[PDB]
Design a protein around this ligand. Structure first.
Ligand SMILES: NC(=O)c1ccc[n+]([C@@H]2O[C@H](COP(=O)([O-])OP(=O)(O)OC[C@H]3O[C@@H](n4cnc5c(N)ncnc54)[C@H](OP(=O)(O)O)[C@@H]3O)[C@@H](O)[C@H]2O)c1
Length: 215
């Protein structure tokens, strides 16, 4: 027989970079929740019902260290998972160190995350797979790349990547609007339908190892 694969592949940030980014994500959620322009849009954010504390709202958080997922394999059950694992480049890079560039932080009524911009070599570790779900269109590859920081209670694993994909798809169409504020890290935007994106002024470099997760 052949040996079974991980739940997923990806970069797994260092203790430091996880701690460094996790705290940075949590400062953002308070700055946002405590922002007037934000408090103006709770009607589009939730359904019913006062000021909301986003850090408890996104109550489902990463147990330990943060990670950027490349290919979710589900132990071989997922499509293209098989071809993706035998790629030479995936085998070349398994165990190698990497640095990732976080260009922005976002929030929607479902997820909080951090956009990841992959380099050209890192993009080679991105699955150029056949069966793109509606969102992938239009955006350069690797755009889906992110790190999950939080999810609302009843939200499913895939949504974080889709939330970012929907947002970028809108910036694509030029519906960003103008920056409605200058958060301490950078520029803020309201995209409607309870969507937001902060474009960091100095992009955050985190160090990580490309490996697989089983658990
Ligand atoms: N013994 C245990 O059971 C144990 C112990 C410790 C921790 N855990 C946690 O339990 C989790 C198990 O995974 P899960 O049930 O949360 O999600 P999952 O479906 O098992 O997938 C795991 C990861 O893959 C990504 N993913 C999930 N669905 C996807 C899809 N349709 N397309 C692309 N990527 C997808 C997500 O990463 P992104 O959101 O980053 O894209 C997610 O964090 C692990 O993440 C681990 O942290 C479990």
């Amino acid at each position: 027989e052949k040996d079974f694969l991980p739940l997923y592949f990806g970069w797994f940030l260092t203790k430091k970079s996880s701690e460094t980014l996790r705290k940075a994500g949590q400062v953002f959620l308070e700055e946002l929740g405590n922002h007037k322009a934000f408090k103006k849009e709770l009607r589009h954010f939730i359904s019913g019902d006062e000021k909301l504390e986003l850090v408890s709202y996104f109550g489902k958080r990463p147990p330990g260290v943060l990670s950027c997922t490349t290919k979710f394999c589900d132990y071989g059950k997922a499509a293209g998972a098989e071809e993706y694992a035998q790629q030479e480049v995936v085998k070349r890079s398994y165990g190698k160190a990497f640095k990732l560039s976080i260009s922005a932080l976002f929030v929607t009524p479902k997820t909080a995350g951090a956009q990841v911009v992959l380099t050209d070599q890192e993009l080679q570790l991105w699955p150029s797979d056949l069966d793109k779900p509606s969102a992938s269109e239009g955006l350069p590859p690797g755009s889906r790349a992110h790190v999950t920081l939080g999810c609302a209670a009843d939200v499913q694993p895939v949504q974080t990547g889709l939330d970012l994909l929907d947002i970028l798809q809108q910036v694509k169409g030029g519906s960003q609007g103008e920056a409605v504020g200058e958060l301490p890290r950078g520029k803020l935007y309201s995209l409607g339908k309870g969507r937001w994106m902060l474009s960091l002024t100095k992009k955050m470099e985190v160090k990580a190892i490309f490996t697989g997760y089983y658990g």
